[PDB]
């Protein structure tokens, strides 16, 4: 218990709660009463977080192709830059992957249907990238060990 994070849901502007299911699937859900929609938001750097499903203990990650997946182990793909757009929304993007030449970030995002999107199809200034933490409580976390 050295890190000061939060237990929280992540509400998507698209009208869903982010969800990480037992089977490892990521998506948005209308079910405001789901154990999974719970996340540990863990600070691993200045405006850097890890996002972990409380029920599954899996970390959200983005691979080199822009695809979001779940990881049992904490890796550099599990770190998200946290930023706010227009002072109203929170955006999460890859720390290590980026639009080559474009210099544009790759974001966590849901589409109108609540489906997870390819990181490079999500733009910071678009509804898909727009989230709002719905915090339950403050929590202390042992720091995750970084793997490869």
């Amino acid at each position: 218990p050295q890190l000061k994070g939060i237990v929280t849901k992540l509400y998507s502007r698209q009208g869903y709660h982010l969800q990480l299911q037992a089977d490892g699937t990521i998506d948005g859900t209308k079910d405001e009463d789901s154990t999974y929609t719970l996340f540990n938001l863990i600070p691993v750097g200045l405006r850097v977080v890890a996002i972990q499903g409380v029920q599954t203990k899996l970390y959200l990650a983005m691979n080199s192709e822009g695809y979001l997946y779940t990881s049992e182990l904490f890796t550099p793909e599990c770190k998200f830059k946290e930023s706010v757009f227009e002072n109203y929304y929170v955006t999460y993007s890859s720390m290590i992957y980026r639009q080559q030449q474009s210099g544009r970030g790759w974001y966590l995002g849901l589409n109108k249907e609540g489906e997870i999107m390819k990181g490079n199809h999500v733009k910071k200034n678009k509804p898909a990238a727009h989230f709002l933490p719905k915090p339950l409580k403050v929590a202390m976390y042992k720091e995750p060990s970084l793997h490869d």
Partner: protein, 153 residues
């Protein structure tokens, strides 16, 4: 001195030095945070051009100022938004903030000050506004309830 094509005027090391000096007045324990309720005072207390003189609410609410739980704002976010107000908006700006965060991280051994974003100044403003309405409505209902009660008299 640093100046861009969009800058109202240039900034110098003295401005950043002045920034910390004022910061320490509001954050004497170097927690790296101030409470949002003193942000307006902090902004007004800086020297020009970083200063945002009162009334300064509109300017502040228009800046990207993320708030950690509860209602606490990091010095780095404040530092960046205030300097961007002066230097002006630019493409590189967004990328420059990422680099600044990285440099701050490399220089800072005190990791305890890293906390995730929970809300924003604008969201807080909406919570406050909603409460004004909620209080008005409860006052209204209570006045009504007592009124009905007193009728029997």
């Amino acid at each position: 001195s640093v100046a861009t094509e969009e800058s109202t005027e240039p900034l110098s090391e003295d401005d950043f030095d002045m920034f910390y000096e004022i910061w320490e007045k509001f954050d004497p324990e170097a927690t790296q945070f101030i409470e949002y309720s003193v942000l307006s005072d902090f902004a007004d207390a800086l020297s020009e051009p970083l200063r945002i003189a009162k009334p300064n609410q509109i300017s502040l609410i228009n800046m990207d100022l993320p708030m950690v739980s509860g209602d606490r704002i990091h010095c780095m976010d404040i530092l960046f938004a205030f300097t961007k107000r002066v230097l002006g908006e630019s493409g590189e700006m967004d990328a420059l903030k990422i680099q600044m965060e990285e440099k701050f991280m490399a220089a800072n051994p005190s990791k305890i000050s890293y906390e995730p974003i929970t809300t924003t100044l604008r969201r807080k403003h909406e919570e406050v506004s909603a409460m004004v309405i909620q209080r008005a409505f409860r006052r209204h209902l209570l006045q009504r309830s007592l009124k009905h009660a007193s009728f029997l008299f």
